[PDB]
From a paper:
Lipocalins are typically small proteins (about 200 amino acid residues) composed of an 8-stranded up-and-down antiparallel β-barrel and one α-helix. There is a hydrophobic cavity inside the β-barrel capable of binding a hydrophobic or amphiphilic ligand. Bos d 2 contains a central β-barrel composing of eight antiparallel β-strands (A-H). In addition, there is a short β-strand (I) as well as an α-helix.
Numbering used by the authors: 6 to 156
Write the structure that this text describes.
Amino acid sequence: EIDPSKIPGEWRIIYAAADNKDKIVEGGPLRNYYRRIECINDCESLSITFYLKDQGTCLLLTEVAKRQEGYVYVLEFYGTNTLEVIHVSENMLVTYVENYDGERITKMTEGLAKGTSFTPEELEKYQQLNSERGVPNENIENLIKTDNCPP
């Protein structure tokens, strides 16, 4: 059960995982450094602020994802995406994204944090969510360690 009151916040991304790992490694289009999620009209839309890093340059973007059904949203960004908020707590948010780039479908997750770094229970929860959705835990990338764009 998703509590929409917990969705908004100054989130940072710790981990991402994808079946097509090339999408989320450094230089990949779906390696996105979160800064903020804002709910618009009671989460009818999510306004998501994040950085892309390209050739050493930090690109600060805000993209708006529109509600499709429940907490599944849609946005065009390097292809057609659905983005689902699959877990949210006071300190953790996990997304599940399906991206179609005209050639491949990519299934991926993002593990976002507030406060201190992911605990062991948070790490395990993230891996369990991945396994439930067929996203390989062997394809987990640590994003926070390469996030050197402005706070």
